[PDB]
RNA sequence: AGAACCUUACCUGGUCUUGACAUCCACGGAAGUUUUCAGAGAUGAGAAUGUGCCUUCGGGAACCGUGAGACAGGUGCUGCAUGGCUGUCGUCAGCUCGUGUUGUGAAAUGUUGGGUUAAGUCCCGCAACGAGCGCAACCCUUAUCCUUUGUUGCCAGCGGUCCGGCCGGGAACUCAAAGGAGACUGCCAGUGAUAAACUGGAGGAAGGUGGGGAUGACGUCAAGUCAUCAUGGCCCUUACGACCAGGGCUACACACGUGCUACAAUGGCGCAUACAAAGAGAAGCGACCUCGCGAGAGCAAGCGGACCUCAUAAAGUGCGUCGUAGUCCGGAUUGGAGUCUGCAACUCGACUCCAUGAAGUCGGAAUCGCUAGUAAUCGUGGAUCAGAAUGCCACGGUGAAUACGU
């Protein structure tokens, strides 16, 4: 016992070393004795120190093993438990982490078959695992399009789907590797999931034209991603934007959204109006239908369109500031993420100016990286440029990169720098032209 | 006696309740009975550990109690030994399994109940009350308190007749509800009777 | 189709308790009715405060039972698995009716 | 915040003595169930079956029963030994300290003075400068608007209507409960030490601490409570402890305190019929239907409860009659017959029916409350509680008079 000169022996009995011993003054943490004698107390006569890795192999008929904390660990794909080994109630190993899955075969079959195949968070090389992961993906973007999570069949059916053809020999990951080794030669496609994910819901109608994957803005084409996670920062339909395209994009007409959301969009916008204006429009779904049956996208700005056709319906002059956008839900606001050629989403927002007011230096150095010839020159004092470019253009990959060169005054000289706005180009070239004229007139 | 209990007027505004749970007309009474029954056991068992405060909450036929104490070592036990002994006994009293959280109270002589039960100990250890009390009151100002009231009462120092004595320095606004007050009483079971001990502590405006 | 009754003794606690339930429910299946503020019950308690005499000296106490209702109307059979795992604090009772 | 026993601490009688209740030891049996006998009651005696756990094979845990000693127990005395809790002046506005100055000193000054407020509230002055408890503020509720949501809550814009938000339906509105806003002498005019402030006016749902509640300083009364509890001292330890039964706490020549119901026509009675808020409910609330004049009883749905139940609010309003008669006023009292509760309703519950119908025709000396949703009146619910209120606590309905003034 710790800091105590007494020993726990068999059962709850306690003893001590007979004082005639030489290790009576040098107590071990683990002792064996020859004779137990009760005289004043319990005394072991001849005592000797032992190492407790000794007594498990030599008392196999006496060891009781208690397994606690049964937890499924991913890295082995197997359930661990802390084992305690005891004889006569003596805790030989207080704690040893051991494979509970290798210990018992009953429940661990169900646990592994659920985890590494139905949830399927497995680090492995299996081809059916790969294809079923991609199938569950192509279903979960379908649910992300639908905004209704009833299309996919439940995971218990997928567990049954696995369990009916996984043989009874599989109890753990090693047995499963051994089983896939002999079964992959006969039926590779059996473990790959069949296309029965959608059954009878009616959502699985989902229209491809109603839910596009790319948006065309002028000459440009921008990526779309879908996500169903209400209230999240990354929720809503998210447009993905290559960074050099920033100088050709504008926010006009962009709030029209995919056509699969516009009914509840205009319902949210019309109920963003205060109660007196809102009382004019009863019922809101009916008036949303009467609006969408006559409106066409991109012919007008959104606010103007709602104003003029709602005036056509009832004769109220709804002002511009009457519409509230904080009351409009965030997932209906089309998320903006500027991405690179390797789809790294650099900056984000739910309006285009959240990108533009933060990316001007990065867009500027993006322009400078492609402009590898020295139109941009410094220390310039006499006009020696020939024809200064109106709108500087380059090409990267599949898209042209456009900017505007202009003069820059420096109070000691004139310089040429790029600008992403024709107006800023105008005032910059104006000031540079003024300094150039002042330097050139005698 | 005419004043109101400051913690009892400040429960719904500033000082949180000691037990937080729900019951219908059936289970509420014997729930209170069990809440009583565990508390005095914990107090008499850990009276040497300087227990300040007890919180009960009851998660769906379970119990978690959190006891605020000033000294870690005694209540935890060496190498994590005693809290598991406290584990099963409160579950035995409850009839449901229980969880116990030990909450450290730093700045120990700013807690009212610890100050009260501390100054109870020296009166039963018969050191003289004036020095005991002014030592107990200047300490909060020294460690930066901004209100302290202290009282003892009744057969004070072997007196034939009872009297009350209060000290106070700083600011102790009882009538301000936004003022935060630590208050709990104590009794000294001296050889002549019961010394009553009261301590008010004032921390902040909100 | 499922009625989630929340009963608590603190409005400051039951608001986040029903907010957690509603955002988790709409997180994985949507179409949740708003948390309805339903009329609370006030238990008023008259106590004689002196040990022996002076009946007219009393104190008044009350219990406030903040009562909120959350309704979900559509079949949302996957949310229910994580719905039992939300481990809300002891301050509020939850009753689920079908 | 609820005495038929119980409660109960009283009395009388039958009874017990490590005990009715705790802990320590030892022994045996698990625990528990059924039956009968005497007793008003606490005993003694059977039959059935115990005997689950825990592998260290044994014991352990619970419980019962028996005995010894350490011990228990008391609503027993002391509130003038105490804590705690409470009343009180009084929600009165005052009660003090640190430092300084004066006075040998007790003490003063601050805190007095002018104004001013409900307020040592604020301003000015000032041998005072500051500080604390007090006041106010922030606490809750009510008085108006907005944001959120709209079930069981609501029905305006739509239809069908079984005429019933009945349904489809709708979220406006009431409402519900969260977050905000809103009232701060904020603005104006005059007075006023260019002050604090006062008076009047606008605006506004609310205007001058908006209203009500919580909130009670230093302390007084050796105030009340040893019987709520804890507690020092003292007392009994075969009784001042403990069990049980019947009676008492409810008596009755009288006196007082606080209420209820009346003395009536602003009313009684009969019918028709209109309008609420608040609260409770599972050993509970208890729909409908049937039976009874009724108390209720059966049957039995729903309701842990914005749905269902208690649950028809009554004054009222309109009809008809009464007619100033100790009366078609008033209902005490008394007899009979009953209903429910509960082992049990004689002492000593609650209620119904029939029959009777006391005093009382507005209260001496005196005395109390009430400054507006008040006073008065009219009903409702709750707590306690098996059953039990004219008492308390809470709720609405109608709804006043008067304040010259000190």
Swiss-Prot record, chain A:
It comes from the Bacteria. Belongs to the DEAD box helicase family. DEAH subfamily. Not yet known. This is ATP-dependent RNA helicase HrpA. The chain holds residues 638 to 1079 of 1300 of the full protein.
UniProtKB/Swiss-Prot annotation, chain B:
GO terms for biological process: cytoplasmic translation; ribosomal small subunit assembly. The keyword Signal does not apply. Gene3D superfamilies: 3.30.300.20, Ribosomal protein S3, C-terminal domain. Keywords: Ribonucleoprotein, Ribosomal protein, RNA-binding, rRNA-binding. It holds the Pfam family Ribosomal_S3_C. GO terms for molecular function: mRNA binding; rRNA binding; structural constituent of ribosome. PROSITE patterns: KH_TYPE_2 (PS50823), RIBOSOMAL_S3 (PS00548). Residues 38-106 form the KH type-2 domain. The keyword tRNA processing does not apply. GO terms for cellular component: cytoplasm; cytosol; cytosolic small ribosomal subunit. It comes from the Bacteria. Belongs to the universal ribosomal protein uS3 family. Binds the lower part of the 30S subunit head. Binds mRNA in the 70S ribosome, positioning it for translation. NCBIfam families: rpsC_bact. Part of the 30S ribosomal subunit. Forms a tight complex with proteins uS10 and uS14. With proteins uS4 and uS5 encircles the mRNA as it enters the ribosome, which may play a role in mRNA helicase processivity. Some nascent polypeptide chains are able to cross-link to this protein in situ. In collided ribosomes contacts ribosome rescue factor SmrB. This is Small ribosomal subunit protein uS3. The lineage of its organism: Bacteria, Pseudomonadati, Pseudomonadota, Gammaproteobacteria, Enterobacterales. The gene is rpsC.
Curated annotation (Swiss-Prot), chain C:
The keyword Signal does not apply. GO terms for cellular component: cytoplasm; cytosol; cytosolic small ribosomal subunit; small ribosomal subunit; transcription elongation factor complex. GO terms for molecular function: structural constituent of ribosome; transcription antitermination factor activity, RNA binding; tRNA binding. It comes from the Bacteria. Signal peptide: none annotated. Involved in the binding of tRNA to the ribosomes. Part of the processive rRNA transcription and antitermination complex (rrnTAC). The complex forms an RNA-chaperone ring around the RNA exit tunnel of RNA polymerase (RNAP). It supports rapid transcription and antitermination of rRNA operons, cotranscriptional rRNA folding, and annealing of distal rRNA regions to allow correct ribosome biogenesis. In complex with NusB is involved in the regulation of ribosomal RNA (rRNA) biosynthesis by transcriptional antitermination. Part of the 30S ribosomal subunit. Can also form a heterodimer with the transcription antitermination protein NusB. Binding of S10 to NusB is mutually exclusive with its incorporation into the ribosome. The rRNA transcription and antitermination complex (rrnTAC) consists of RNAP, NusA, NusB, NusE (this protein), NusG, SubB, ribosomal protein S4, DNA and precursor rRNA; S4 is more flexible than other subunits. This is Small ribosomal subunit protein uS10. It comes from Escherichia coli (strain K12).
